[PDB]
Design a protein around this ligand. Structure first.
Ligand SMILES: O=C1CN(Cc2ccc(Cl)c(Cl)c2)S(=O)(=O)N1
Length: 135
């Protein structure tokens, strides 16, 4: 066992969202993508195999999948089609995911709170909170 496996592994379904449209605007997502992305009710699937963590987002809008080792930069094409350089670390039990592109930066934190997995997406001063529960 590991902390990561116990906390995060499994299949999660989105149950609430706040300020996601505003977050997407701050990121630079265009109107049509924001509208379609904002409707989605994704499942988030998290798995671990040795040192490799995989996070999948499955929805009618887009399916995404990242696999990574903590602390080790990788390439990511986001749901809104940004080509970013990402680094994910585990800081005090919180997965902290930094994306860099075009001189910009956004941070996504994933954490367990009670029976929820809370995803906080932050761009400058704009935060979106997306809450998931086990499927
Ligand atoms: O709830 C969430 C939100 N995600 C990030 C995410 C998804 C879609 C778009 Cl368009 C953008 Cl800008 C960011 S996630 O995959 O990290 N989980």
């Amino acid at each position: 066992g590991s902390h990561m496996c116990d906390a995060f592994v499994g299949t999660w379904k989105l149950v609430s969202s706040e300020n996601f449209d505003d977050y997407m605007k701050e990121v630079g997502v265009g109107f049509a993508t924001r509208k379609v992305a904002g409707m989605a009710k994704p499942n988030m699937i998290i798995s671990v195999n040795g040192d490799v963590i995989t996070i999948k987002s499955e929805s009618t809008f887009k399916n995404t999948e990242i696999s990574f080792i903590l602390g080790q930069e990788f390439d990511e094409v986001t749901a809104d089609d940004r080509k970013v350089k990402s680094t994910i670390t585990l800081d005090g039990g919180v997965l902290v995911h930094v994306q860099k592109w075009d001189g910009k930066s956004t941070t996504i934190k994933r954490k367990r709170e009670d029976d929820k997995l809370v995803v906080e997406c932050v761009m400058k001063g704009v935060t979106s909170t997306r809450v998931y529960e086990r499927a």
